[PDB]
Amino acid sequence: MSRYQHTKGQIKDNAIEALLHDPLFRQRVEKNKKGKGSYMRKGKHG
RNA sequence: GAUGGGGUUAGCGCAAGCGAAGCUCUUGAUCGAAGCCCCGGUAAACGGCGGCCGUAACUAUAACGGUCCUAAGGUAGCGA
Ligand SMILES: [Mg+2]
Ligand SMILES: [Mg+2]
Ligand SMILES: [Mg+2]
Ligand SMILES: [Mg+2]
């Protein structure tokens, strides 16, 4: 178990909130397999 | 000195009184400039150069916004 090194510096008011506005809890959006962000130049096995 | 208002009195009414001309006391139409008000300009003229409330990826701050006021809200630079 290693410590996550957050980008908030010195947390003052609330830790969880701070974390939430951090890269660790950034939004993740998946790449489309079909649809908009869907075009693949080369396959996984291409 | 325009007009008005008085004072005096030649004269007239059987009389309270009225009262010419003059002189005279007063009122002050009209005329009448600059100034002042007025309309602009001028700050290396004298001078003056704002508040309150909110707002961002913990927190804090607030580039941002709201509103009131002003002739205008302090620029560059500097700053216990
Ligand atoms: Mg004049
Ligand atoms: Mg000027
Ligand atoms: Mg300054
Ligand atoms: Mg000191």
From Swiss-Prot:
Among the GO molecular function terms of this UniProt record, one is: tRNA binding
Effect after changing residue 41 to A: No change in kcat for peptidyl-transferase by RF2
Effect upon mutating residue 39 to C: About 25% ribosome rescue activity, initial rate
* Residue runs in coiled coils: none
Please state what is observed when this gene is inactivated: Cells lacking this gene are viable, but those lacking both arfA and ssrA are non-viable.
Q: Give the result of residue 41 to C, as annotated.
A: About 20% ribosome rescue activity, initial rate
Residue ranges of the region described as Disordered: 30-46
Please describe, based on the UniProt annotation, the reported consequence of changing residue 9 to V.
75% decrease in kcat for peptidyl-transferase by RF2
Sorted keywords for this record are: RNA-binding, rRNA-binding, Translation regulation, tRNA-binding
Q: Does the keyword rRNA-binding apply?
A: yes
Q: Which regions are flagged for Basic residues bias?
A: 33-46
* Mutagenesis / variant outcome for changing residue 34 to C: About 75% ribosome rescue activity, after 10 minutes. About 50% ribosome rescue activity, initial rate
Q: What is the effect of changing residue 18 to C?
A: No change in ribosome rescue activity
The source's domain of life comes to Bacteria
Q: What is the effect of changing residue 20 to C?
A: About 50% ribosome rescue activity, initial rate
Q: Which GO BP terms sit in this record?
A: regulation of translation; rescue of stalled ribosome
Record carries keyword Plastid: no
Q: What else is known?
A: Active protein is only produced when SsrA(tmRNA)-SmpB-mediated trans translation is limited. ArfA can be synthesized from truncated mRNA, via ribonuclease 3 and the SsrA tagging system. In the presence of SsrA, the stalled ribosome is rescued and the incomplete nascent ArfA is tagged for degradation. In the absence of SsrA, truncated ArfA chains are released from the ribosome and are functional.
The entry sums up its family as follows:
Belongs to the alternative ribosome-rescue factor A family.
Partners and quaternary state?
A: Interacts with the 50S ribosomal subunit. Interacts with RF2/PrfB on the ribosome. Contacts ribosomal protein S12 (rpsL).
Question: What is known about what this protein does?
Answer: Rescues ribosomes stalled at the 3' end of non-stop mRNAs. This activity is crucial when the stalled ribosome cannot be rescued by the SsrA(tmRNA)-SmpB quality control system. Binds the 30S subunit, contacting 16S rRNA with the N-terminus near the decoding center and its C-terminus in the mRNA entry channel; contacts change in the presence of release factor 2 (RF2, also named PrfB). Requires RF2/PrfB to hydrolyze stalled peptidyl-tRNA on the ribosome; recruits and probably helps position RF2/PrfB correctly in the ribosomal A site so RF2's GGQ motif can hydrolyze the peptidyl-tRNA bond.
The identity of this protein, by name, is: Alternative ribosome-rescue factor A
Q: Record the organism.
A: Escherichia coli (strain K12)
Please spell out the taxonomic lineage of the organism that makes this protein.
Bacteria, Pseudomonadati, Pseudomonadota, Gammaproteobacteria, Enterobacterales
User: Which gene does this sequence derive from?
Assistant: arfA
Q: Which residues of the full protein are shown?
A: 1 to 46 of 72
